[PDB]
Amino acid sequence: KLTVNAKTAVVSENRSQEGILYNDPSRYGKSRKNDEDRDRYIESRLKSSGKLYRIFNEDELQWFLSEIVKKINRRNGLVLSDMLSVDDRAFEKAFEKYAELSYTNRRNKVSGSPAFETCGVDAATAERLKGIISETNFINRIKNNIDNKVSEDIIDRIIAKYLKKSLCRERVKRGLKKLLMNAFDLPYSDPDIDVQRDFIDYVLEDFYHVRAKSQVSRSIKNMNMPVQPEGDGKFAITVSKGGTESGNKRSAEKEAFKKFLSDYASLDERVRDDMLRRMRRLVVLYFYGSDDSKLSDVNEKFDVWEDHAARRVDNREFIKLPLENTDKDAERIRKNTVKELYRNQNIGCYRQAVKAVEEDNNGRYFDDKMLNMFFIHRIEYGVEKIYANLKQVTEFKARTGYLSEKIWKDLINYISIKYIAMGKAVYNYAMDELNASDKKEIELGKISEEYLSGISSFDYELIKAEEMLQRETAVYVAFAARHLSSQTVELDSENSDFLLLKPKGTMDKNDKNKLASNNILNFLKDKETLRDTILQYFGGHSLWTDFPFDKYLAGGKDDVDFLTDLKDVIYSMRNDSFHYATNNGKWNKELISAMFEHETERMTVVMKDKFYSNNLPMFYKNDDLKKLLIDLYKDNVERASQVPSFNKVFVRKNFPALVRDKDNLGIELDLDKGENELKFYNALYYMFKEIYYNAFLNDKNVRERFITKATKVADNNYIAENDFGQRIKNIVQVNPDYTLAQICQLIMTEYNCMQKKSAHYKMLLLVNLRKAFLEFIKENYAFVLKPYKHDLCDKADFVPDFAKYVKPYAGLISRVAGSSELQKWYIVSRFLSPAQANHMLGFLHSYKQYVWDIYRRASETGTEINHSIAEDKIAGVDITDVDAVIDLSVKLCGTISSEISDYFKDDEVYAEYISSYLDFEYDGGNYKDSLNRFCNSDAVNDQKVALYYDGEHPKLNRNIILSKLYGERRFLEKITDRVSRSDIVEYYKLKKETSQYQTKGIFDSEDEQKNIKKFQEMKNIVEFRDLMDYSEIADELQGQLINWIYLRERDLMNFQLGYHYACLNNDSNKQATYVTLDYQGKKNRKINGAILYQICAMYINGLPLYYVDKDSSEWTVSDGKESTGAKIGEFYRYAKSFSDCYASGLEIFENISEHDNITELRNYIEHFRYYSSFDRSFLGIYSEVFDRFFTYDLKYRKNVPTILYNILLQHFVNVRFEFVSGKKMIGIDKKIAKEKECARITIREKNGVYSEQFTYKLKNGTVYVDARDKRYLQSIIRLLFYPEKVNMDEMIEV
């Protein structure tokens, strides 16, 4: 990259913007480059590569081609830096002047190569310089290192494979081939091509970068944001300042489209229909000529959407494809030929359309010629986007109808993203009065004072940070509501949203004698066990025997109101904007606050018990752990993001060998010898993790040793350490108070494809952190160096007083009691799985770091930025408190009670639940006796099964309990096979085989590593850990779907805001209540810019909406807490005061005919209907999202399959997609729903799924093992395809 070690930004002074270059990290006064230093930096970076300039970049035939290009690039070859620097570089200025004049001659009409006499050189020396850059000298320099004969095919393959990108032009490539054919004395004819002018002269222009030298710096200075305020304080799409002849034409075309956006925002549907028809005629003219039948009658009001559907099925060919010869180097030649055919036809289409719009308009197109030229340029650009990086030559992509309809949707896409861009600026910077206030009259759509002078790039970075966390939080709100409802209510198709159920006292609106249809009482599964079921998600009801529920549930209140209170906490976070505050809890704040305090009082005992459960005291004295437990948990630690994880710094497989090494630690434990050796390394690994995060990363002495140990080579892979150390040295000079975490963040930022990639600084950060940790252990925690195995005491006897030593939640208890917002973060995070709560905590860390980095870079560049987004607060509450709250949920969600009665009624109900995942041979009588008969039956030889029993009761399995609370059991039954006897037989066999060499880490033979891997996979199966992996994968696939839901809902609101903002500010006819609302009720209020307020009120929980009620037929105002569906219905009731205002302009956003299908798809996902019906596959849901969920922005739609690919590859599953046809419905029966073809994303039937391979290093060499066995891949396929069945033996490749 050109500006490799610089950053760009857009700053605004007074409605004047400037793109700037700045160094990062740097200080104010040494970061932002002035106009002169910007120019010199670009020119310096451009000419810092002249030395290694080569015209060529980088099987028997493929390797002969590699030898030719290297011999040409070696010394005495075609090395321009040596040819042009001849005679002590006395002619370098004349050669560069020649290159600049050659480029100027191309622009300014003058034909012919420039004469060196005009370059400051006499006529005698001029004839010498001409010879140096002559065809003769180029031929001699190319043949100087070549002793082989080459053919025309070799020249063609070399040009197509290795030619420099900037030289890959039609006439340049033809000039190079003509020279290469003349060099090797091959007959060739191309008289239209001049080798000197078409190739050699251009190479000189490219060698001296005459184009970039006079354009890159200026193009950077003219960069800007999508939307900026104009003179009258109005937001509009940014128009370039121009400055050149083509720049003034381009800006005038952009001004014509800006008026189009204003004119198109009209409530009169006939106006928009006429404007789209004129745009449609431009597309028809471009691809079918002015003689097309749809252009004959100027006044013909033809249906633009039938023309769109008709051309798509036309068989006309845009270009004719040549025959294919797989010879991959020959196919690269064919694709290059096809691209030039596209370009030639695209140019022909452009010139004929430009001519016809100037000579034969007459009402066919737009009256503004600049608007016609803007669209024609968009069409030509749209064609180039399709073929410029053509993936694979296909026939359908060469059809004229395919391209014309892709461009048609491309034009509408451009209109869509511009309205959304306008709404984004309006929502964030012109809706200030949405914040709660006592003002009886408010004005929406007026830009705030701080942004009347323009928007900077740093401003939009803050928006992204806030919108990312908002969307990520919305995913977990849905999951929290799902987990709470999973065991408490049973929903149907008419009441599928748990958060929308009504309190127990809700009666019908037309008959006050009957309960409301959405009354929560109509859906409770077991009212008598409601409290104990709810308390399962709070650690088990046995932990709340001393909690005074009757105090907070007094009078008529019972456990139904308890469920309703928790339901209300979660719902209050749905659609809860972080940017606009509407912190008053509807629920019982005292009950939720008391439950939080009750859970904090067990935090110290839980963290103490984790030392006990990890067998840590089994090898260490009891006062050394107590001094450690105090050191680690005395204060709540807020972790920073972008810091390498403990599991990546200390790989678990290399952990035993690393600790035994006497240069590192040299820990020596001598002793069921293999049993306790594994217990010790598992104990030591957990202890080092807790020390790593809660003491090591924040230790002052650690930061100082790290800086010196990492900057050692800087004061002396060797190339990396001196550059790595110099950047650490620079970071400390910029700010000596940067923490160790901030040094890692700044280093890891420079270390950083849309697609996850399958099989310098990051490795050095892991090394320096690993070494610094081992030295931290020896100095501060030397007791770990001398373990001693002994029998452990009882859990109650292990540091019983630890609760009184440390009280880290002392201050947080009181602040949670008086904060409704903190109680939201508590309940929502508490009802998540441990993995999801950890992910939520990670998202909060990324938010704080992102905001911190934005202000750091804005300050170093001297860019004034409004601090509406606090570094230490989110939604008016401290981030440190939110962090400690979610961190409490993370630890407690993973703390399963030791009482079976907390989750099941008795041992029989529990044993029957285990039968869904374990086939312990159920005879038909009781499940407990069948499970006890199975656990005490012989497995192999003299070792029986056991595993699932503990004395007189079945063993409490942590993974089974977690899958009941946070998993989906009927989903797990359909995609997994139950654990059978043959599985347990193979488990003990592999454990006995590997018992000799289980605790080494780096094994001897290749067969030992493959048996350890097979055993670890069998252990995960027998302990139900394969179940938890599939649940996480399903949660990640479902979470991404819910993420996309709130991505679209944000942009739908932005589109409506920007569209109606443009309508408010044009001369189109608008009525009174559209512009101003004068509500005269009890809660009277006057709303200026009423349409903008009412749009935002639809999407913000707590924002009231003004409307005419359906039953009273009178004006009213809601409390703002009603559902989105109810608010949309209220908007329609408001719109009747001034033909579909809600859907106005949405033909740009989506297909109106499918609007109800999008809502049904949205509800299907967010209401978790897949886990009740199983009527569609995950691939089927992702297919429909790709087909029609992101109609409004191509950049979101065209990345949907890649995102699905990345989620699977993250779990080491590689899939090969195939895009075929499915079915979808258009409309919902009321009875109009018709079926239509739909995009279907599927996996290739033959070798479409394969596992990533692990690189396992041994003593001598390396063994490659599949990361995922066939059994694992089969469940992944079933997860993606169910209910559809496929041939998984044929699909999986091994």
Q: Scanning residues 1149 to 1188, which ones bind RNA (CB under 7 A)?
A: 1186-1188
Which C-beta is closer to RNA: that of 160 or that of 267?
Answer: 160
Q: Residue 944 carries which DSSP code? A: E
Stretch of 228-236, 387-395, 493-501, 713-721 contacting RNA, by CB under 7 A: 387-395
Which C-beta is closer to RNA: that of 236 or that of 563?
Answer: 236
Q: How far is the CB of 123 from RNA (least distance, A)?
A: 27
Q: Buried (b) or exposed (e) across 934-972, using 16+ Cβ within 10 A?
A: bbeeebeeeeebebbbeeeebbbbebbbbbbbbbbbebb
Interatomic CA distance for residues 420 and 426, integer angstroms? 10
Q: How far is the CB of 1225 from RNA (least distance, A)?
A: 12
The answer to whether 103 touches 68, Cβ cutoff 8 Å, is no
Q: How far is the CB of 981 from RNA (least distance, A)?
A: 21
Stretch of 78-86, 396-404, 946-954, 1270-1278 contacting RNA, by CB under 7 A: 396-404
Q: Using CB under 7 A, which residues numbered 145 to 184 contact RNA? A: 165-166, 169-170
Exactly one of 223, 275, 637, 1075 binds RNA (CB under 7 A); that residue is 223
Alpha carbons within 13 angstroms on the beta-carbon side of residue 331 total 9
Exactly one of 201, 255, 380, 986 binds RNA (CB under 7 A); that residue is 380
Which C-beta is closer to RNA: that of 210 or that of 591?
Answer: 210
β-partners of residue 12 are 17
Q: How far is the CB of 703 from RNA (least distance, A)?
A: 17
Give backbone dihedrals phi and psi of 1010, rounded to 5 degrees, phi first.
Answer: -80, -25
Checking 905-908 for CB contacts under 8 A at 24+ apart, the result is 907/953, 907/954
Q: Using CB under 7 A, which residues numbered 554 to 593 contact RNA? A: none
Which C-beta is closer to RNA: that of 776 or that of 1107?
Answer: 776
Q: Using CB under 7 A, which residues numbered 963 to 1022 contact RNA? A: 991, 994-995, 998-999, 1012, 1015-1016, 1019
User: For residue 843, which of 283, 338, 380, 467 has the smallest C-alpha distance?
Assistant: 467
Q: How many helices (H) and strands (E) does the chain have?
A: 55, 21
Interatomic CA distance for residues 323 and 300, integer angstroms? 42
The answer to whether 144 touches 103, Cβ cutoff 8 Å, is no
Position 943 contacts RNA (CB under 7 A): no
**How far is CA 1076 from each of CA 663, 1068, 1108, 1109, 1249, rounded to the nearest angstrom?**
78, 16, 15, 19, 59
Position 229 contacts RNA (CB under 7 A): no
End-to-end Cα spacing for the chain: 39
The answer to whether 830 touches 892, Cβ cutoff 8 Å, is yes
Which C-beta is closer to RNA: that of 1102 or that of 1222?
Answer: 1222
Position 828 contacts RNA (CB under 7 A): no
Encoding tokens for residue 1166? 């967010």
Exactly one of 1257, 1270, 1283, 1290 binds RNA (CB under 7 A); that residue is 1257
Exactly one of 1219, 1232, 1283, 1287 binds RNA (CB under 7 A); that residue is 1219
Which C-beta is closer to RNA: that of 899 or that of 1109?
Answer: 899
Position 1141 contacts RNA (CB under 7 A): no
Q: Using CB under 7 A, which residues numbered 276 to 305 contact RNA? A: none
Q: Using CB under 7 A, which residues numbered 843 to 862 contact RNA? A: 846, 849-850, 853
Stretch of 124-132, 176-184, 928-936, 1190-1198 contacting RNA, by CB under 7 A: 1190-1198
Q: How far is the CB of 276 from RNA (least distance, A)?
A: 16
The residue assigned the tokens 């050669």 is: 95
Exactly one of 654, 936, 943, 1247 binds RNA (CB under 7 A); that residue is 654
Exactly one of 241, 439, 867, 1083 binds RNA (CB under 7 A); that residue is 241
For 935, the 3-state DSSP assignment is: helix
Exactly one of 1220, 1232, 1233, 1294 binds RNA (CB under 7 A); that residue is 1220
Q: How far is the CB of 143 from RNA (least distance, A)?
A: 28
Q: Which residues contact 1160 (CB under 8 A, 6 or more apart)?
A: 1228
DSSP-based helix, strand, coil % in the chain, nearest 5: 55, 10, 35
Which C-beta is closer to RNA: that of 142 or that of 239?
Answer: 239
Encoding tokens for residue 25? 């990290």
Exactly one of 196, 682, 937, 1065 binds RNA (CB under 7 A); that residue is 682
Number of residues lying near RNA (CB under 7 A)? 177
Q: How far is the CB of 1140 from RNA (least distance, A)?
A: 22
Each residue 90-109 as x (binds RNA by CB under 7 A) or -, in order, gives: ----------------xx-x
Encoding tokens for residue 930? 């069948």
Helix (H) or strand (E) holding 856: helix 834-860
Encoding tokens for residue 1289? 């033996």
Position 1276 contacts RNA (CB under 7 A): no
Stretch of 59-67, 379-387, 539-547, 591-599 contacting RNA, by CB under 7 A: 379-387
Q: Using CB under 7 A, which residues numbered 521 to 560 contact RNA? A: none
Tell me whether residue 264 is exposed, middle or buried, using C-beta atoms within 10 angstroms of its C-beta: 0 to 12, 13 to 18, 19 or more: buried
User: For residue 902, which of 533, 601, 562, 610 has the smallest C-alpha distance?
Assistant: 533
Q: Using CB under 7 A, which residues numbered 892 to 931 contact RNA? A: 894-896
Stretch of 528-536, 1059-1067, 1114-1122, 1213-1221 contacting RNA, by CB under 7 A: 1213-1221
Q: Using CB under 7 A, which residues numbered 18 to 57 contact RNA? A: 19, 46
Q: How far is the CB of 529 from RNA (least distance, A)?
A: 25
The residue assigned the tokens 């120019």 is: 39
Residue 1149 is which amino acid? Answer: F
Each residue 434-473 as x (binds RNA by CB under 7 A) or -, in order, gives: -----------------------x--xx--x--xx-----
Exactly one of 70, 71, 130, 249 binds RNA (CB under 7 A); that residue is 249
Interatomic CA distance for residues 747 and 769, integer angstroms? 13
Q: How far is the CB of 1193 from RNA (least distance, A)?
A: 7
Helix (H) or strand (E) holding 337: helix 328-359
Neighbours of 582 (CB within 10 A): 17
Exactly one of 48, 326, 389, 510 binds RNA (CB under 7 A); that residue is 389
Interatomic CA distance for residues 238 and 261, integer angstroms? 12
Give backbone dihedrals phi and psi of 1237, rounded to 5 degrees, phi first.
Answer: -60, 150
Q: Residue 618 carries which DSSP code? A: G
Position 729 contacts RNA (CB under 7 A): no
Exactly one of 238, 861, 976, 1073 binds RNA (CB under 7 A); that residue is 238
Q: How far is the CB of 662 from RNA (least distance, A)?
A: 20
For 441, the 3-state DSSP assignment is: strand
Q: Using CB under 7 A, which residues numbered 685 to 704 contact RNA? A: 685-686, 689, 693
Each residue 1028-1057 as x (binds RNA by CB under 7 A) or -, in order, gives: ---------------x---x----------
Q: How far is the CB of 300 from RNA (least distance, A)?
A: 23
For 225, the 3-state DSSP assignment is: coil
Q: Buried (b) or exposed (e) across 503-535, using 16+ Cβ within 10 A?
A: bbeeeeeeeeeebbeebbbbbbeeeeebbbbbb
**How far is CA 311 from each of CA 206, 288, 320, rounded to the nearest angstrom?**
42, 10, 18
Q: Residue 641 carries which DSSP code? A: S
Q: Using CB under 7 A, which residues numbered 733 to 752 contact RNA? A: 745, 748-749, 751-752
Stretch of 177-185, 705-713, 949-957, 1192-1200 contacting RNA, by CB under 7 A: 1192-1200
Q: Residue 1202 carries which DSSP code? A: H
Which C-beta is closer to RNA: that of 299 or that of 392?
Answer: 392
Cis-peptide into 800, omega within 30 deg? no
Stretch of 391-399, 438-446, 798-806, 874-882 contacting RNA, by CB under 7 A: 391-399
